[PDB]
Design a protein around this nucleic acid. Structure first.
Lengths: 248, 91, 98, 62, 135
RNA sequence: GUUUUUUCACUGACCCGGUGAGGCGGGGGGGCGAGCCGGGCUCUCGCUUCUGGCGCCAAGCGCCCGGCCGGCCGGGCGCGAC
RNA sequence: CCGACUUAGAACUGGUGCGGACCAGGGGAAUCCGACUGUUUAAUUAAAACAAAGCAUCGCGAAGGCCCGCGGCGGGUGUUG
RNA sequence: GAAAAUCCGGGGGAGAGGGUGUAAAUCUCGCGCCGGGCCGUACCCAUAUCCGCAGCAGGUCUCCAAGGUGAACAGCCUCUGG
């Protein structure tokens, strides 16, 4: 009769993200006349560390094309970006690393990142540390650029939506082992309350549907229905195939 | 002197964490603390500040590199590939 | 003529009169002694145009060495790295006509 | 250099000469990267006039 | 030629007049016993003549283009030489190194450069030289 | 014709994304290429990429319009900015 | 000319007493379990239990997965990919 | 590995200022002048002023920190203080 941990996680208060020292929302620049019809120049001020993000960020200070002010945008830092590098953004901007442009105006087999899945959403795809999205093909009619994603699944996109050229920085951080539990404690204090993972077989039967028993077992198949209700849906969710994977 | 046979920087972990998990991590732990050859000055000063962010303590120029190495293998092969498709577009 | 410049640079170091460094070469440009200025490709681009604008006024050839200041220092027979090099008298070198 | 290291709300009291050094971008920017942003502010502006003069060539021949 | 002439325009690179435009009246190629560094005395323009517009007053325009000049010895590396040059006399009789003994004499070299930058501003010759550097 | 109805795009509720709702769509003036013996057209670009400066509150060219003794002391309105 | 603190050596010597009080590790050979550090039933269980790094599948490319909510163009993960 | 109040410098140059003075506009210089309301302020702070029914061997956040012995804020002994 007690709510399971996942149901409690959904509420808030405790299982929310620790957004205090987070150095801001990593997003692209907003589309205007200087993005759609040509390009605009803005300098990389400083590559910076975002607590709760594996990849670093970049304060890229553009000049405002309308106002006397000078705008500053928090980009996902492409691997090989540096301070005082000119990063150009728009249609007529060149095809080199950091130099963001819409996917219709770059060839196929091109590595992108911080890619818009819908035109305007301002950077959503392939934008964790070291992830590369390829430009598979083009469809000049209907604007359908097929894009291979870090998962591997190809997405038909609207070909008028912008990605920063090159892979995201902080690449290959999952190669280093967390050797001691303390390093993992410090990793998840930066993000949200989810780390010290209590396995269901250890939990009592009132808390978790894998609980109880004089032996520490499951007893029921852990592979569960997609329809399965709020609290029961536990273990291998809607598992097509399960057990040990061999080859491809 | 020579003070450890075949534990390097990962000698600081002592007996803990495994043999293969102090035979694998040494490769990372060496590279991330390595004073690399800077490209902007030449000065052996490319010191890792944080994760994927490499800083020169001479020019004061911060570079978004790999996590443990200044340039990961699959970031420089991309750079040449982006530069190859660059020339193949413009002509 | 890429590997011939490593040979010619030695023949200024051994025989000719040279000035390795920026501040000392930026003067020996201004003295009207600089018959060549050699820059490394990883020199500051402010200092690149700074030199190329004095060598406009001096009417002197700015040779862009196709290596970094670490490689240029090795080519110029030193153990220290050097971006800017100016030649006062090449000695027995065709560096100006090459 | 030439500006007092002091609590920020103290500078109401300090005279003008205590707070800035006598130069363009004096007491706001370091003199080393002033004289790099005087040269660049000129040498980039010189390069614009070479573009103004090379534009006066390529159209007169057609 | 040897590009540090007594007619060359020169950017002042450091000091109080950092970014001010100056014209060399004397280059001293070797080091004098007083100033062992290779130096060149310039007479530049401290306060610039302002951007002037049509349909202003006659008496109003006469207030705008008031050049306030300076006179100063700088080094060759506290100055930036340009490709520009100004045809200006600036006689040795006033604009001189004998003028750095008396603050009364220095009100005349500040006044001598003032006039010959003022009454040759209204010509439109050397119109680069009187427009302030943008930084 | 009338309705049952598969299949393409239509927008107009309805949903989503961005924005400080800042240049969208046709058309014209103005530059690159194509075809006829100054001629009238079919389509393309429409201004910034060698460097850790600078850029806001318009210059310019038009036109009416306030006094005093056709000459002397200014504001407003258009392109510039179709 | 002004030294401030130790290390080392040898003498001599007491009724072999002398780290003189105080401070302050019992030691070895094996077995089972848990790698370790950490944690745990406040008031009978501090454990071989929990956690753990590592390892392995599973779901999901956002109108999405996982979850919350009486409700919503609602809310958490999400300042996310 | 905090924001924000707050403060300051800079870059710009719309303006303002006086006509050779009894100078002006102006000053982050040195004096001078006037003012600063409102609320808390005693004492205990723990083997007797707090919380555990109580002068309850429990619990309860900090600041200062002498001499000797000694590796030592260890233990023991002593000074001020109690």
């Amino acid at each position: 009769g007690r709510v399971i941990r996942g149901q409690r996680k959904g509420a808030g208060s405790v299982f929310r993200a620790h957004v205090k020292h987070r150095k801001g929302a990593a997003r692209l620049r907003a589309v205007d006349f200087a993005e759609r019809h040509g390009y605009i120049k803005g300098i990389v001020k400083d590559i910076i560390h975002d607590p709760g993000r594996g990849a670093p960020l970049a304060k890229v200070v553009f000049r405002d094309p309308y106002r006397f002010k000078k705008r500053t945008e928090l980009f996902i830092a492409a691997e090989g970006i540096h301070t005082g590098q000119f990063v150009y953004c728009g249609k007529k901007a060149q095809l080199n690393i950091g130099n963001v442009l819409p996917v219709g105006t770059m060839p196929e087999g091109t590595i992108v990142c911080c890619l818009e899945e819908k035109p305007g959403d301002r950077g959503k795809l392939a934008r964790a540390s070291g992830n590369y999205a390829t430009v598979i093909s083009h469809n000049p009619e209907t604007k359908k650029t097929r894009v291979k994603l870090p998962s591997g699944s190809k997405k038909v996109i609207s070909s008028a939506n912008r990605a920063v050229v090159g892979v995201v920085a902080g690449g290959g951080r999952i190669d280093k082992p967390i050797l001691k539990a303390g390093r993992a404690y410090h990793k998840y204090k930066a993000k949200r309350n989810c780390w010290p993972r209590v396995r269901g077989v250890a939990m009592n039967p009132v808390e978790h549907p894998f609980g109880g028993g004089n032996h520490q077992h499951i007893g029921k198949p852990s592979t569960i229905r997609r329809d399965a209700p709020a609290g029961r849906k536990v273990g291998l969710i809607a598992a097509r195939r399960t057990g040990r994977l061999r080859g491809t | 002197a020579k003070r450890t046979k075949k534990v390097g920087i990962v000698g600081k972990y002592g007996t803990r964490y495994g043999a293969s998990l102090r035979k694998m991590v040494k490769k990372i732990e060496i590279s991330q603390h390595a004073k690399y050859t800077c490209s902007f000055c030449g000065k052996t000063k490319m010191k890792r500040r944080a994760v994927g962010i490499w800083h020169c303590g001479s020019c004061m120029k911060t570079v978004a590199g790999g996590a443990w190495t200044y340039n990961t293998t699959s970031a420089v092969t991309v750079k040449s590939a982006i530069r190859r498709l660059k020339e193949l577009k413009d002509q | 003529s890429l590997e011939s410049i490593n040979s010619r640079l030695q023949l200024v170091m051994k025989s000719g009169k040279y000035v390795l460094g920026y501040k000392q070469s930026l003067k020996m440009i201004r003295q009207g002694k600089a018959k060549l200025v050699i820059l490394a490709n990883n020199c500051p681009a402010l200092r690149k145009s700074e030199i190329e604008y004095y060598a406009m006024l001096a009417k002197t050839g700015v040779h862009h060495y196709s290596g970094n200041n670490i490689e240029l220092g090795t080519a110029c027979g030193k153990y220290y790295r050097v971006c800017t090099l100016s030649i006062i008298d090449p000695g027995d070198s065709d560096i100006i006509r090459s | 250099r030439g500006v007092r290291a002091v609590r920020p709300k103290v500078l109401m009291r300090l005279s003008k000469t205590k707070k800035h050094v006598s130069r363009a971008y004096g007491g706001s920017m370091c003199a080393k990267c002033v004289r790099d942003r005087i040269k660049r502010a000129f040498l980039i502006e010189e390069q614009k006039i070479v573009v103004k003069v090379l534009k006066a060539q390529a159209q007169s021949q057609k | 030629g040897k590009f540090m002439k007594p007619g060359k325009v020169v950017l002042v690179l450091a000091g109080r007049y950092s970014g001010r435009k100056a014209v060399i009246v004397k280059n001293i190629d070797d080091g004098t016993s007083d100033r062992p560094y290779s130096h060149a005395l310039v007479a530049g323009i401290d306060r610039y003549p302002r951007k002037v517009t049509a349909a202003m007053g006659k008496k109003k325009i006469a207030k705008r283009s008031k050049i306030k000049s300076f006179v100063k010895v700088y080094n060759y590396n506290h100055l930036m030489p340009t490709r520009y040059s100004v045809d200006i006399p600036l006689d040795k009789t006033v604009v001189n190194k004998d003028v750095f003994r008396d603050p009364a004499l220095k009100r005349k070299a500040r006044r001598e450069a003032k006039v010959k930058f003022e009454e040759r501003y209204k010509t439109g010759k050397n119109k680069w030289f009187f427009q302030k550097l943008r930084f």
